[PDB]
């Protein structure tokens with residue numbers, strides 16, 4: 001049950017003026033594509049705060065990747081779901097290498113020692129349903145540079161890969177061998193989604209990761225490994241189970257590789273330079 005929003009004063013949305021004319025802001029299955037200028041964050045923050053939303057963020061830091069955690073977590077503190085309850089889940093082979101990062105109130109961090117493999121690990125299934133409402137699964141070699149907030153939350157979302165958002169579907173680097181579970185033909189495909197940022201309600205994320213893990217097992221059994229590994233399977237899943245929101249490349253950018261085009265008004269979550 002959802003109580004009433006309080007009175008709020010904000011600019012009237014205007015039916016006969018689009019927010020953004022330069023980009024597609026809704027998919028043909030009527031899922032929002034989240035770009036800056038499409039959302040009023042005050043309205044969304046009220047809606048989510050009224051449900052006492054908790055967001056889990058999962059990140060893997062194995063071997064050398066533990067070096068990326070300090071900047072990742074410190075910048076998540078400045079920019080990710082500020083004002084809402086957050087539970088970071090750090091999966092690592094080195095628990096004593098996780099940096100001590102000061103957290104804001106209502107935010108917690110769990111270290112989970114571990115011995116493509118992210119899909120199996122994420123799919124933890126009992127714990128997540130009891131502790132968070134949504135799960136967001138990202139790469140650790142990244143930093144937040146701007147607001148990443150509740151505008152992303154929805155049953156199931158993927159993020160446009162920054163190298164492919166302008167590309168025709170034949171150019172997408174989908175798995176193209178019919179022998180793989182991840183196979184997608186050249187006349188199919190909506191978008192190319194990056195493996196580095198996806199999420200959803202706990203139930204939807206567990207469904208996805210369970211499906212991708214079972215498809216990867218089948219492929220392994222069969223002597224085949226998809227061209228872009230878990231990302232290839234992520235893309236097959238989201239082709240057949242349409243996400244309820246799609247994040248624009250503001251949410252996964254590499255400024256060194258791609259610059260700062262006019263279509264990106266904010267660069268929110270970005271790659272960190274790495275040898």
Ligand SMILES: O=c1ccn([C@@H]2O[C@H](COP(=O)(O)OP(=O)(O)O)[C@@H](O)[C@H]2O)c(=O)[nH]1
Nearest residue numbers: 059060061062063064065138139140141196
């Ligand atoms: O040795 C490794 C290799 C990969 N990863 C995790 O796997 C993610 C995806 O791999 P990576 O970022 O290396 O691939 P890329 O983004 O360069 O294609 C990394 O962010 C880490 O979260 C890790 O923790 N240790």
Ligand SMILES: OC[C@H]1O[C@@H](O)[C@H](O)[C@@H](O)[C@H]1O
Nearest residue numbers: 161163172173194195228231
């Ligand atoms: O073509 C797909 C690939 O594109 C690269 O730019 C990216 O670094 C890879 O991780 C993979 O997503």
Ligand SMILES: [Mn+2]
Nearest residue numbers: 139140141196
């Ligand atoms: Mn990465």
